[PDB]
Amino acid sequence: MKTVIQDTADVYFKRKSDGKLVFTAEAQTASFSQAISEEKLRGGIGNKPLYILKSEKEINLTVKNAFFDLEWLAMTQGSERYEVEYRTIAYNPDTEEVYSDIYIQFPNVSPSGEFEMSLENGNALAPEIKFEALADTDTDEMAVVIEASRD
Amino acid sequence: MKTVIQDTADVYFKRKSDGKLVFTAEAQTASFSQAISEEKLRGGIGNKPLYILKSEKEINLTVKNAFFDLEWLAMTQGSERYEVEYRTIAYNPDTEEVYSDIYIQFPNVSPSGEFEMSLENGNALAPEIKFEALADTDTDEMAVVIEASRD
Amino acid sequence: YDYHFEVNGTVVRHKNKGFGYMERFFELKESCDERSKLSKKQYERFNALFNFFEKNGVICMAKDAGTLNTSIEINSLAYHGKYDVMKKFIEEQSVSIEDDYKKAFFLACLGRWEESYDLYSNIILNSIDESNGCVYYLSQINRYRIYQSITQAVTQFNGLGLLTFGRHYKPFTDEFLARIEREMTNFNIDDLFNGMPFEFQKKYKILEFLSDNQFLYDDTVKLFELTNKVRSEMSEGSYSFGMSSDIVVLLRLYDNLRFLYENCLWSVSFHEFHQYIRNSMSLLIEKAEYERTRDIDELGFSFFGKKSGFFMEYYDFVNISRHFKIDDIKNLERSCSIDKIRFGEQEKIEEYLVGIAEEITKQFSANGMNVVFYTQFISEAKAALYFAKYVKLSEEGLGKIVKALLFYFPERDLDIGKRYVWLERLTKCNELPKSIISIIDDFLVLQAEKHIDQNYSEVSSNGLYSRDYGALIKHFEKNFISKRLSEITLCLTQDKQKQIDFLFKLLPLLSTNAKSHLLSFKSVENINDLMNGIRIGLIDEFTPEHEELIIEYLETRKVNYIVEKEKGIQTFSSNDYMSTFGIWYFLEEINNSKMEEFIGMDDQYDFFVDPENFDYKKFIPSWLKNYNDKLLGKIAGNKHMKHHVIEVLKERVKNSNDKRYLEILMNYFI
Amino acid sequence: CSIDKIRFGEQEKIEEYLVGIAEEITKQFSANGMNVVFYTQFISEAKAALYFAKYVKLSEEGLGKIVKALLFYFPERDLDIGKRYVWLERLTKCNELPKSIISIIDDFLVLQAEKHIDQNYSEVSSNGLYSRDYGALIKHFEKNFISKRLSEITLCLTQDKQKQIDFLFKLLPLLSTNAKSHLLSFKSVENINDLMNGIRIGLIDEFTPEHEELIIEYLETRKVNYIVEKEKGIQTFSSNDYMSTFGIWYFLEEINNSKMEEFIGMDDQYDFFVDPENFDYKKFIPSWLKNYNDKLLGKIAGNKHMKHHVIEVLKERVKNSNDKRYLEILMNYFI
């Protein structure tokens, strides 16, 4: 009743081209990493270059799930734009009331899993999943948000 | 043979105004420190000083490989602040021969180390000591360095 | 515990209350006359001692010892990355129990485990026939960690595999799993040292520590102790030439390095050793470069007026290839420093590079594929490829790497943008000879032979495509007009239009006839084509039609932005062309005055085109990192409002926790 | 990396435990009992609880109990005043330093003057504090004082107490006017150390040709000491080395003598300050900027000869280190 405070989050997945329902109940770690950097990508010729807009834009996703779905998992036992739709909530410190919901959506996510969880002792499962943000050539994609704090 | 850096360094002491010779020798630690720190202790003055060169100084000195001695220990078993001299050998990278020695000595030193280790797993003695090099108000003190290799 | 064995090879008394039997032995070692006062009865045991005693390298005690030196060498061929010779040895028949143990070790080294487990099964069956003590328990540990690895990988493919590889790859027969699970229901390793004959431990007390989970506890404690020990020793003292810092660290480092790596025990691929190597290597580089740049008033350099400099050896490089993810600069360049040392001699490390490259080409060039092998090779190869950039050597090494990366690397684990990142960072410390240019040209030809698919989109996480390869080719050699690209452009008619994007992206590397054909095949209607034409440098000025098109695009942006604001769905526009338009306006490139009616869409646009009516409370500091273009200097050359610029600069550098924000103006004006 | 404030405060428990850890010193060997087990604890956590001045903000009573305490009720294997005084200054950022506290450090330094006798142990001051620093310490936050207890102490003594008269001589600003007049007689006239003491305590205001003669005498003594050291191959580092002081005094019009230039080539800072034109800037150790005042850094940034390489070495150091003081001095003054 002192300061062991903490919140929760929702993680929703989806497979494109059909209405497949895949989601994650809870994400404890939920380490979100965003990187912008550059080293050198300009020759420097043509007198007036007239343009430069390079910016390395990567979005990293990480969830831990114990709920895959057998509805399809069993059928597949005997890909798609895993596209991800994060869900969470926000609170106002002045009132501390449930009034706002925050959605985060990614329409093109390709999982980049590492096959090296080599460890001696048996853990509490905890199959941490890490994702990479993939983009097409056309336009848009990356992240989309919806605000639900209307009053 | 392949890759390891190796030398030796000894630790020697003495007592001021006495011929007492009782201390650890050849401490592999023989650790030392030096620091100059300044703070806001002159933020305000009669607006006509010359200089004081305050320069808060700090000197740690720790040596540890035990086996101090047994004779002067027994004599004292029944505050001159002691005296310490140090010796280090420098090797020529071009020739790699024993040609140069470095002499270090401090007039005043105060061994002020914590007196409660109490490790659960009994070590091989290991009574680590630390020292603070004191200075008087007359002059000199700190380090008197004599350079060998007069060839 | 009668003697405390210092890892430096010298021994000291710990609990010996009796005669100095180690002192007696060491004083006998240095005296040949006393060695001559013994019969063959003790000589038969002197012969036995000699071998391993000098194999480790114990010299004397810590009192009279002078300048010491340890021997570092690895006979672990599995560590040498030559799998072909181990396959050759595997095909060899059986000789004896010890040889069976070695062969089991190499079978485990290949990754597949079925026949390996069968082999340890038979060896447990017949081990008591030879009544060999230690190897029996070593084989217990063997089969235990083999099963642990199999089950862990199974849990990994257990789920994860279907999403990753698309198909449920079952590399093990269900009968095998049923048998192993029925024979390992209850087995826990704690009693593995409790149920063995009591004559075992009296002769093998030391070796029990490899059974339980204490395989790492005794090791990492001193590591994480000395880490802060030296990190706080820092650069003001605790100073000597060969007793400062990692002295004992190399000792234990290469003493326990080959322990499992030469006895041929199995979990050589475990995150414990990822951990151990990464930490160890970091301590080495840290001591070296804290020596390197430390301030020396008079006595800082009087001590150790020589440096070890961390001259890394082939063994360390292989460690980085095997068990390194940050690989050390990946985070310890954003954090740590670098300045030259000598990346020294090479004996056959180029042969190891080809021992990686040719094995990769043979594997990915063969239809047969082992998923366990691919999973146990992909990460180590990734590390080796990522850190073969800084090496410079006879291009024996370069062309095989380029060919293998271009033609055999899996496309599920990497996209084109990260591929170019690998090839661009390859040339950071290396030039561009003709062989690599030919190889990448052949790769581009293969890509052109691929671009017929009606649904392929070339999805990438970096935004860079094959056009960047021709761009790099021009950057190092402008006069390399292509040959086959002109042919494929000429052979393409107006009926098919799916290659228009690729031809526009790679139009600079085309013949004059190809250029004329593409000019007759040009089309500019949307926004992307204009951006691409500007990118290649073809477009110099702007026609009124382009201004009208950009005004229409901005009007559409406004009429959808107002709708989004009405509902309350904030906008992102990840490919923020509005910032590009702000850049257009700021640099006097477009001198129109019709874009001032759209002020307020984004904070960046307000900062760019509205300097008089902008509030600096919404200043995002990431706007200084988008680039390194001179454009940053041009826009930072401010006089009117530079007070706010220096205010935010001093607020940011008060922490001084980002090296970019300081090295941007380190000596740029100088 | 260290910001000094954070969310600091929480008077209640930090203040009670501050005074509570102040309390045990009262029951001490100087009062009663020297059990070593108590000193096996001694300070294992508390000399830095003295450094806990920079950390959170305290109260007036915290200022009071952080100070008339230790002055007694303590054993003597010294743990020194360098510590005492640096933490005394380090509390200044926390709160005010007059009526709550100065009304007791006045008596503290008076009782300090009470200490010295003719010839017992000379003086040490451990790290090289000098006790006398109190004269300028009062000037740091306030002006001269009129304290009367040590004034009577110096008004009763007349002779033979050389150590007592010289040590209390450095508390002249807090003396009474009659005390100052009495101490001006039978006082060490022109000893070099006493000359620095007098000019530090504000007794002297301007240099004199006799002071110049003493300065050149010290310079030639240092030169012959360096000559014999080079004969014996000996190097000495002393806390009482004023060569840098002489160099910077010559740099900023304090000494107008031209005969002082003959000693170039003995100390690195001496070459750096006395001869900016011919100085080899490689020997300039960049750690000396810490012990330079704000006005010294400002004046050192107005001259041409210390501008070409100083900015470059500062840039190299601040790229090669994460320290904040050099960064602050380079943008605040050097830029």
PDB file of N, CA, C and O in Angstrom, chain B residues 38-44 50-51 53 55-56 81 112 115 134-147, chain D residues 79 85-86 89 123-124 126-127 130 139-140 199 207 233-235 237-238 240 245 248-249 252 290-291 293 295-296:
ATOM      1  N   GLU B  38      38.186  20.662  -6.258  1.00  0.00           N
ATOM      2  CA  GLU B  38      37.893  22.035  -5.874  1.00  0.00           C
ATOM      3  C   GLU B  38      36.388  22.217  -5.750  1.00  0.00           C
ATOM      4  O   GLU B  38      35.606  21.521  -6.403  1.00  0.00           O
ATOM      5  N   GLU B  39      35.989  23.164  -4.904  1.00  0.00           N
ATOM      6  CA  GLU B  39      34.583  23.432  -4.643  1.00  0.00           C
ATOM      7  C   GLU B  39      34.391  24.931  -4.451  1.00  0.00           C
ATOM      8  O   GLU B  39      35.326  25.724  -4.604  1.00  0.00           O
ATOM      9  N   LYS B  40      33.163  25.318  -4.109  1.00  0.00           N
ATOM     10  CA  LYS B  40      32.802  26.730  -3.964  1.00  0.00           C
ATOM     11  C   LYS B  40      33.069  27.195  -2.532  1.00  0.00           C
ATOM     12  O   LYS B  40      32.163  27.504  -1.756  1.00  0.00           O
ATOM     13  N   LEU B  41      34.355  27.237  -2.189  1.00  0.00           N
ATOM     14  CA  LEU B  41      34.798  27.760  -0.905  1.00  0.00           C
ATOM     15  C   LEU B  41      35.418  29.145  -1.011  1.00  0.00           C
ATOM     16  O   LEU B  41      35.835  29.703   0.009  1.00  0.00           O
ATOM     17  N   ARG B  42      35.492  29.715  -2.217  1.00  0.00           N
ATOM     18  CA  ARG B  42      36.003  31.067  -2.404  1.00  0.00           C
ATOM     19  C   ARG B  42      34.990  31.955  -3.118  1.00  0.00           C
ATOM     20  O   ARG B  42      35.374  32.964  -3.719  1.00  0.00           O
ATOM     21  N   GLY B  43      33.708  31.602  -3.064  1.00  0.00           N
ATOM     22  CA  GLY B  43      32.670  32.406  -3.679  1.00  0.00           C
ATOM     23  C   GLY B  43      32.350  33.645  -2.870  1.00  0.00           C
ATOM     24  O   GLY B  43      31.257  33.770  -2.310  1.00  0.00           O
ATOM     25  N   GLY B  44      33.303  34.571  -2.807  1.00  0.00           N
ATOM     26  CA  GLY B  44      33.159  35.773  -2.012  1.00  0.00           C
ATOM     27  C   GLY B  44      34.443  36.128  -1.295  1.00  0.00           C
ATOM     28  O   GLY B  44      35.003  35.308  -0.562  1.00  0.00           O
ATOM     29  N   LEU B  50      45.619  37.918  -3.564  1.00  0.00           N
ATOM     30  CA  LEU B  50      46.670  37.650  -4.537  1.00  0.00           C
ATOM     31  C   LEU B  50      46.524  36.265  -5.157  1.00  0.00           C
ATOM     32  O   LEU B  50      46.351  36.168  -6.373  1.00  0.00           O
ATOM     33  N   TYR B  51      46.548  35.205  -4.347  1.00  0.00           N
ATOM     34  CA  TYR B  51      46.236  33.808  -4.655  1.00  0.00           C
ATOM     35  C   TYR B  51      46.498  33.016  -3.379  1.00  0.00           C
ATOM     36  O   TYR B  51      47.239  33.459  -2.497  1.00  0.00           O
ATOM     37  N   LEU B  53      46.097  29.208  -3.850  1.00  0.00           N
ATOM     38  CA  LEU B  53      46.303  27.874  -4.417  1.00  0.00           C
ATOM     39  C   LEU B  53      45.864  26.797  -3.421  1.00  0.00           C
ATOM     40  O   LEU B  53      46.664  26.013  -2.908  1.00  0.00           O
ATOM     41  N   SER B  55      43.493  24.032  -3.630  1.00  0.00           N
ATOM     42  CA  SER B  55      43.726  22.746  -4.289  1.00  0.00           C
ATOM     43  C   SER B  55      43.618  21.568  -3.316  1.00  0.00           C
ATOM     44  O   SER B  55      44.612  20.927  -2.967  1.00  0.00           O
ATOM     45  N   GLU B  56      42.391  21.310  -2.854  1.00  0.00           N
ATOM     46  CA  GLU B  56      42.125  20.132  -2.030  1.00  0.00           C
ATOM     47  C   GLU B  56      42.700  18.875  -2.667  1.00  0.00           C
ATOM     48  O   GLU B  56      42.335  18.511  -3.791  1.00  0.00           O
ATOM     49  N   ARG B  81      53.622   8.792  13.199  1.00  0.00           N
ATOM     50  CA  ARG B  81      53.087   8.749  11.840  1.00  0.00           C
ATOM     51  C   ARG B  81      53.981   7.985  10.869  1.00  0.00           C
ATOM     52  O   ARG B  81      53.741   8.025   9.656  1.00  0.00           O
ATOM     53  N   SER B 112      44.320   4.132   7.693  1.00  0.00           N
ATOM     54  CA  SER B 112      42.947   4.252   8.193  1.00  0.00           C
ATOM     55  C   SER B 112      42.051   3.377   7.321  1.00  0.00           C
ATOM     56  O   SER B 112      41.452   3.846   6.352  1.00  0.00           O
ATOM     57  N   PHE B 115      37.770  -2.039   9.756  1.00  0.00           N
ATOM     58  CA  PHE B 115      38.221  -3.134  10.605  1.00  0.00           C
ATOM     59  C   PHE B 115      37.193  -4.257  10.717  1.00  0.00           C
ATOM     60  O   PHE B 115      37.205  -5.001  11.703  1.00  0.00           O
ATOM     61  N   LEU B 134      49.776  11.818   4.865  1.00  0.00           N
ATOM     62  CA  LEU B 134      49.566  13.095   5.529  1.00  0.00           C
ATOM     63  C   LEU B 134      50.681  14.077   5.183  1.00  0.00           C
ATOM     64  O   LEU B 134      51.740  13.705   4.672  1.00  0.00           O
ATOM     65  N   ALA B 135      50.423  15.351   5.472  1.00  0.00           N
ATOM     66  CA  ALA B 135      51.386  16.419   5.254  1.00  0.00           C
ATOM     67  C   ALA B 135      51.349  17.371   6.439  1.00  0.00           C
ATOM     68  O   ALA B 135      50.281  17.632   6.997  1.00  0.00           O
ATOM     69  N   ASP B 136      52.513  17.888   6.820  1.00  0.00           N
ATOM     70  CA  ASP B 136      52.595  18.805   7.946  1.00  0.00           C
ATOM     71  C   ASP B 136      52.330  20.231   7.466  1.00  0.00           C
ATOM     72  O   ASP B 136      51.852  20.457   6.351  1.00  0.00           O
ATOM     73  N   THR B 137      52.618  21.212   8.319  1.00  0.00           N
ATOM     74  CA  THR B 137      52.464  22.617   7.972  1.00  0.00           C
ATOM     75  C   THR B 137      53.785  23.303   7.641  1.00  0.00           C
ATOM     76  O   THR B 137      53.772  24.461   7.209  1.00  0.00           O
ATOM     77  N   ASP B 138      54.919  22.622   7.809  1.00  0.00           N
ATOM     78  CA  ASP B 138      56.209  23.280   7.607  1.00  0.00           C
ATOM     79  C   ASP B 138      56.533  23.437   6.124  1.00  0.00           C
ATOM     80  O   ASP B 138      56.562  24.556   5.600  1.00  0.00           O
ATOM     81  N   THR B 139      56.741  22.315   5.426  1.00  0.00           N
ATOM     82  CA  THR B 139      57.145  22.322   4.022  1.00  0.00           C
ATOM     83  C   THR B 139      57.259  20.904   3.474  1.00  0.00           C
ATOM     84  O   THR B 139      57.091  19.929   4.214  1.00  0.00           O
ATOM     85  N   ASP B 140      57.528  20.788   2.173  1.00  0.00           N
ATOM     86  CA  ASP B 140      57.896  19.529   1.517  1.00  0.00           C
ATOM     87  C   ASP B 140      56.734  18.548   1.630  1.00  0.00           C
ATOM     88  O   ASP B 140      55.642  18.863   1.125  1.00  0.00           O
ATOM     89  N   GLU B 141      56.910  17.377   2.251  1.00  0.00           N
ATOM     90  CA  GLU B 141      55.889  16.334   2.327  1.00  0.00           C
ATOM     91  C   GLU B 141      55.531  15.836   0.929  1.00  0.00           C
ATOM     92  O   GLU B 141      56.221  16.165  -0.042  1.00  0.00           O
ATOM     93  N   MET B 142      54.471  15.039   0.816  1.00  0.00           N
ATOM     94  CA  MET B 142      54.076  14.413  -0.457  1.00  0.00           C
ATOM     95  C   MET B 142      55.222  13.540  -0.964  1.00  0.00           C
ATOM     96  O   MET B 142      55.806  12.779  -0.174  1.00  0.00           O
ATOM     97  N   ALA B 143      55.586  13.607  -2.239  1.00  0.00           N
ATOM     98  CA  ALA B 143      56.426  12.590  -2.852  1.00  0.00           C
ATOM     99  C   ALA B 143      57.776  13.178  -3.227  1.00  0.00           C
ATOM    100  O   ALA B 143      57.847  14.220  -3.888  1.00  0.00           O
ATOM    101  N   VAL B 144      58.838  12.503  -2.799  1.00  0.00           N
ATOM    102  CA  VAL B 144      60.203  12.821  -3.191  1.00  0.00           C
ATOM    103  C   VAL B 144      60.669  11.684  -4.085  1.00  0.00           C
ATOM    104  O   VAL B 144      60.873  10.558  -3.614  1.00  0.00           O
ATOM    105  N   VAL B 145      60.854  11.977  -5.369  1.00  0.00           N
ATOM    106  CA  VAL B 145      61.144  10.971  -6.383  1.00  0.00           C
ATOM    107  C   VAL B 145      62.605  11.093  -6.786  1.00  0.00           C
ATOM    108  O   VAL B 145      63.061  12.176  -7.167  1.00  0.00           O
ATOM    109  N   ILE B 146      63.332   9.983  -6.710  1.00  0.00           N
ATOM    110  CA  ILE B 146      64.725   9.910  -7.130  1.00  0.00           C
ATOM    111  C   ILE B 146      64.800   9.013  -8.355  1.00  0.00           C
ATOM    112  O   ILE B 146      64.271   7.894  -8.345  1.00  0.00           O
ATOM    113  N   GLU B 147      65.448   9.501  -9.407  1.00  0.00           N
ATOM    114  CA  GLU B 147      65.511   8.799 -10.681  1.00  0.00           C
ATOM    115  C   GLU B 147      66.858   8.103 -10.820  1.00  0.00           C
ATOM    116  O   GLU B 147      67.911   8.740 -10.702  1.00  0.00           O
TER     117      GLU B 147
ATOM    118  N   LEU D  79      41.384  11.908  11.741  1.00  0.00           N
ATOM    119  CA  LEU D  79      40.624  11.624  10.543  1.00  0.00           C
ATOM    120  C   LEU D  79      40.465  13.099  10.444  1.00  0.00           C
ATOM    121  O   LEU D  79      39.747  13.691  11.247  1.00  0.00           O
ATOM    122  N   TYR D  85      36.619  20.539   6.914  1.00  0.00           N
ATOM    123  CA  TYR D  85      36.424  21.824   6.257  1.00  0.00           C
ATOM    124  C   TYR D  85      35.760  21.674   4.897  1.00  0.00           C
ATOM    125  O   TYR D  85      34.934  22.512   4.516  1.00  0.00           O
ATOM    126  N   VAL D  86      36.110  20.631   4.141  1.00  0.00           N
ATOM    127  CA  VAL D  86      35.483  20.455   2.838  1.00  0.00           C
ATOM    128  C   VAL D  86      34.000  20.180   3.009  1.00  0.00           C
ATOM    129  O   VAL D  86      33.175  20.667   2.233  1.00  0.00           O
ATOM    130  N   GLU D  89      32.269  23.482   3.955  1.00  0.00           N
ATOM    131  CA  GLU D  89      31.933  24.196   2.729  1.00  0.00           C
ATOM    132  C   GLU D  89      30.795  23.511   1.980  1.00  0.00           C
ATOM    133  O   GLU D  89      29.923  24.182   1.417  1.00  0.00           O
ATOM    134  N   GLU D 123      52.788  21.857  13.834  1.00  0.00           N
ATOM    135  CA  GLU D 123      51.459  21.655  13.281  1.00  0.00           C
ATOM    136  C   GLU D 123      51.545  20.747  12.065  1.00  0.00           C
ATOM    137  O   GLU D 123      52.544  20.741  11.341  1.00  0.00           O
ATOM    138  N   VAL D 124      50.485  19.974  11.853  1.00  0.00           N
ATOM    139  CA  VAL D 124      50.395  19.039  10.737  1.00  0.00           C
ATOM    140  C   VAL D 124      49.271  19.428   9.782  1.00  0.00           C
ATOM    141  O   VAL D 124      49.508  19.671   8.597  1.00  0.00           O
ATOM    142  N   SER D 126      47.138  17.520   8.650  1.00  0.00           N
ATOM    143  CA  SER D 126      46.851  16.321   7.865  1.00  0.00           C
ATOM    144  C   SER D 126      47.035  16.517   6.364  1.00  0.00           C
ATOM    145  O   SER D 126      48.152  16.406   5.849  1.00  0.00           O
ATOM    146  N   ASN D 127      45.940  16.788   5.651  1.00  0.00           N
ATOM    147  CA  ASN D 127      45.984  16.896   4.196  1.00  0.00           C
ATOM    148  C   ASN D 127      46.696  18.151   3.714  1.00  0.00           C
ATOM    149  O   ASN D 127      46.933  18.281   2.508  1.00  0.00           O
ATOM    150  N   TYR D 130      45.203  24.424   6.734  1.00  0.00           N
ATOM    151  CA  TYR D 130      46.156  25.183   7.520  1.00  0.00           C
ATOM    152  C   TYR D 130      45.511  25.843   8.717  1.00  0.00           C
ATOM    153  O   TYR D 130      46.163  26.629   9.396  1.00  0.00           O
ATOM    154  N   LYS D 139      35.342  35.366   5.154  1.00  0.00           N
ATOM    155  CA  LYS D 139      35.189  36.290   4.037  1.00  0.00           C
ATOM    156  C   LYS D 139      34.401  35.665   2.896  1.00  0.00           C
ATOM    157  O   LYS D 139      33.836  36.385   2.065  1.00  0.00           O
ATOM    158  N   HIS D 140      34.364  34.334   2.839  1.00  0.00           N
ATOM    159  CA  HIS D 140      33.672  33.644   1.753  1.00  0.00           C
ATOM    160  C   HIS D 140      32.197  34.019   1.701  1.00  0.00           C
ATOM    161  O   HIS D 140      31.648  34.283   0.625  1.00  0.00           O
ATOM    162  N   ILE D 199      49.183  37.915   4.045  1.00  0.00           N
ATOM    163  CA  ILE D 199      48.511  38.411   2.850  1.00  0.00           C
ATOM    164  C   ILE D 199      47.212  37.648   2.604  1.00  0.00           C
ATOM    165  O   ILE D 199      46.289  38.172   1.966  1.00  0.00           O
ATOM    166  N   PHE D 207      51.974  44.729  -2.387  1.00  0.00           N
ATOM    167  CA  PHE D 207      53.339  44.233  -2.307  1.00  0.00           C
ATOM    168  C   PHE D 207      54.314  45.373  -2.024  1.00  0.00           C
ATOM    169  O   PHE D 207      54.052  46.544  -2.317  1.00  0.00           O
ATOM    170  N   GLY D 233      69.706  13.657  -9.089  1.00  0.00           N
ATOM    171  CA  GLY D 233      68.639  13.033  -9.850  1.00  0.00           C
ATOM    172  C   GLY D 233      67.368  12.846  -9.048  1.00  0.00           C
ATOM    173  O   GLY D 233      66.751  11.778  -9.088  1.00  0.00           O
ATOM    174  N   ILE D 234      66.966  13.882  -8.314  1.00  0.00           N
ATOM    175  CA  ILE D 234      65.830  13.817  -7.403  1.00  0.00           C
ATOM    176  C   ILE D 234      64.759  14.791  -7.872  1.00  0.00           C
ATOM    177  O   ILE D 234      65.063  15.910  -8.298  1.00  0.00           O
ATOM    178  N   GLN D 235      63.504  14.355  -7.805  1.00  0.00           N
ATOM    179  CA  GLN D 235      62.350  15.193  -8.092  1.00  0.00           C
ATOM    180  C   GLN D 235      61.461  15.259  -6.860  1.00  0.00           C
ATOM    181  O   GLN D 235      61.217  14.241  -6.205  1.00  0.00           O
ATOM    182  N   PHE D 237      57.781  16.854  -5.086  1.00  0.00           N
ATOM    183  CA  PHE D 237      56.458  17.454  -5.192  1.00  0.00           C
ATOM    184  C   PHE D 237      56.005  17.813  -3.787  1.00  0.00           C
ATOM    185  O   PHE D 237      55.980  16.949  -2.904  1.00  0.00           O
ATOM    186  N   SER D 238      55.666  19.080  -3.574  1.00  0.00           N
ATOM    187  CA  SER D 238      55.326  19.583  -2.252  1.00  0.00           C
ATOM    188  C   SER D 238      54.004  20.335  -2.294  1.00  0.00           C
ATOM    189  O   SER D 238      53.707  21.039  -3.265  1.00  0.00           O
ATOM    190  N   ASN D 240      53.507  22.758  -0.381  1.00  0.00           N
ATOM    191  CA  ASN D 240      53.926  24.130  -0.131  1.00  0.00           C
ATOM    192  C   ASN D 240      54.790  24.686  -1.259  1.00  0.00           C
ATOM    193  O   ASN D 240      55.686  25.500  -1.012  1.00  0.00           O
ATOM    194  N   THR D 245      52.208  29.997  -8.011  1.00  0.00           N
ATOM    195  CA  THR D 245      51.715  31.277  -7.515  1.00  0.00           C
ATOM    196  C   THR D 245      52.574  32.426  -8.024  1.00  0.00           C
ATOM    197  O   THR D 245      52.046  33.439  -8.493  1.00  0.00           O
ATOM    198  N   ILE D 248      51.856  32.971 -11.853  1.00  0.00           N
ATOM    199  CA  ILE D 248      50.605  33.654 -12.179  1.00  0.00           C
ATOM    200  C   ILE D 248      50.608  35.084 -11.646  1.00  0.00           C
ATOM    201  O   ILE D 248      49.985  35.972 -12.242  1.00  0.00           O
ATOM    202  N   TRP D 249      51.295  35.340 -10.526  1.00  0.00           N
ATOM    203  CA  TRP D 249      51.441  36.713 -10.052  1.00  0.00           C
ATOM    204  C   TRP D 249      52.205  37.556 -11.063  1.00  0.00           C
ATOM    205  O   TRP D 249      51.837  38.705 -11.331  1.00  0.00           O
ATOM    206  N   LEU D 252      49.848  38.377 -13.968  1.00  0.00           N
ATOM    207  CA  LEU D 252      48.761  39.332 -13.784  1.00  0.00           C
ATOM    208  C   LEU D 252      49.181  40.564 -12.989  1.00  0.00           C
ATOM    209  O   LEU D 252      48.471  40.983 -12.068  1.00  0.00           O
ATOM    210  N   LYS D 290      41.342  23.040 -13.165  1.00  0.00           N
ATOM    211  CA  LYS D 290      40.427  22.857 -12.042  1.00  0.00           C
ATOM    212  C   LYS D 290      40.749  23.811 -10.899  1.00  0.00           C
ATOM    213  O   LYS D 290      39.838  24.342 -10.252  1.00  0.00           O
ATOM    214  N   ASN D 291      42.035  24.044 -10.633  1.00  0.00           N
ATOM    215  CA  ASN D 291      42.466  24.901  -9.537  1.00  0.00           C
ATOM    216  C   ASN D 291      42.612  26.361  -9.950  1.00  0.00           C
ATOM    217  O   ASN D 291      43.368  27.104  -9.314  1.00  0.00           O
ATOM    218  N   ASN D 293      40.612  30.045 -10.666  1.00  0.00           N
ATOM    219  CA  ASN D 293      39.390  30.761 -10.348  1.00  0.00           C
ATOM    220  C   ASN D 293      38.660  31.167 -11.628  1.00  0.00           C
ATOM    221  O   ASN D 293      39.199  31.099 -12.737  1.00  0.00           O
ATOM    222  N   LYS D 295      37.716  34.188 -12.504  1.00  0.00           N
ATOM    223  CA  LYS D 295      38.378  35.349 -13.089  1.00  0.00           C
ATOM    224  C   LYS D 295      39.694  34.969 -13.760  1.00  0.00           C
ATOM    225  O   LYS D 295      40.050  35.552 -14.790  1.00  0.00           O
ATOM    226  N   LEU D 296      40.425  34.001 -13.201  1.00  0.00           N
ATOM    227  CA  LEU D 296      41.651  33.539 -13.845  1.00  0.00           C
ATOM    228  C   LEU D 296      41.357  32.866 -15.180  1.00  0.00           C
ATOM    229  O   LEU D 296      42.096  33.054 -16.152  1.00  0.00           O
TER     230      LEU D 296
END
